[PDB]
């Protein structure tokens, strides 16, 4: 899980 975008 990226902390700066929820985009896949």
């Amino acid at each position: 899980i990226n902390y700066y975008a929820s985009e896949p």
Partner: single-chain antibody
Amino acid sequence: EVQLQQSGAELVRPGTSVKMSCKAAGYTFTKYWIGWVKQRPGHGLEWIGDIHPGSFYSNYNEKFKGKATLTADTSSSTAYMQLSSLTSEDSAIYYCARDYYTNYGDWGQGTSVTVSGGSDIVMTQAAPSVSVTPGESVSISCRSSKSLLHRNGNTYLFWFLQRPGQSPQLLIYRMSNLASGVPDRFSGSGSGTAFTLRISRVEAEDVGVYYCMQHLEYPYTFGSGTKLELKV
């Protein structure tokens, strides 16, 4: 179980601000994004932005940059949204939803507020409604303005049902996958740019508005909805 418990209805006047809350429980608050969605009559569902309570970083739909402010409090596991310069356009129900690996599978109950982009992916749903008799099967179509296929191999198309007086619920994720708790009478297929939700053996519990949504690229976008009702 995951719970998202939103603050109460607001009756407010134009030109003011309002701040609403979304209390999370049943999972690690700082691990997942929380998105916010606006449900305004005649205007379907519209995505506002999201926030990561671990980093406090927020992403906004450009349409809401200068309207909405997302914050989070890790002490109380609460996400907040503040709206400024309220107008009639802001009268709506506002939902928070937890993003689980791109799935908006957990939704708050909504907060009602009553006020007394060229490159965005456009999602279309040609049918405003479908009228069916119980036990009939039905197909609902959606199209996206660009492919929703990602380099990882997944197609980031989602279907939701919003039953009358309820929050949206996730039915199908990543084009074809059945969400937990949803009957396997629901299925999804598509080409990456055109999609079909199929419902076999329709029953009264299936009544409501069906929305497609893309979670490929910010801003996330929803189709205009197709209302399912039982027949004339």
